[PDB]
Design a protein around this ligand. Sequence first.
Ligand SMILES: [Ca+2]
Length: 223
Amino acid sequence: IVGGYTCGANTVPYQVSLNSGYHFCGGSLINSQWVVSAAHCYKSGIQVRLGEDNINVVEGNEQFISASKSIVHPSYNSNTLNNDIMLIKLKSAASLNSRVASISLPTSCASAGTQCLISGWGNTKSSGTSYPDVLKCLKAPILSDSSCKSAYPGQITSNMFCAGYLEGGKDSCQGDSGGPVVCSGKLQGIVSWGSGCAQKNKPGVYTKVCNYVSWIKQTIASN
Ligand SMILES: [Ca+2]
């Protein structure tokens, strides 16, 4: 997250870190057994880390639970990032508590202009590299479809939305991928892509979770 703020330990209790020997992507806990992330975060061999604040210190509220199954969306296209969504099943259910909690799936799609909370352990610099140890947060508004398409001509599908600031300076970034965009208390987006981070006229692009609720529900009812 570039231009964000330190969230505060366990104030984003649905945020997970995906670890394959090191943090590589975020995700969102949607119930005691299942995480939503980005399909481009697929790796074999994922351990889900819940209850994290500093990802490099065991502070005492973590749960580390191996994945048993990962399910990339059936229509994922890694070239365009259309349908950039994945489900990860935990080998055992998390113990839900004040620091490890699920986020609701949406009923309706969020609106342009809504301010959402985006979070992660990704890079904090637009130019260069600095990865935080503690979770960072950013409030960013959803942009109109027309503004999103103007920023990335020929690249935005109906399964994507833009959020952020066309002036630059505030965005998600590498290492935030897969993590949550929460609007009105529900999971509306997944950190997916963007041209660089926090550059002028190049806002973040997010997977539009409301288009996937019936796939998520039928998949979790079956696996
Ligand atoms: Ca930790």
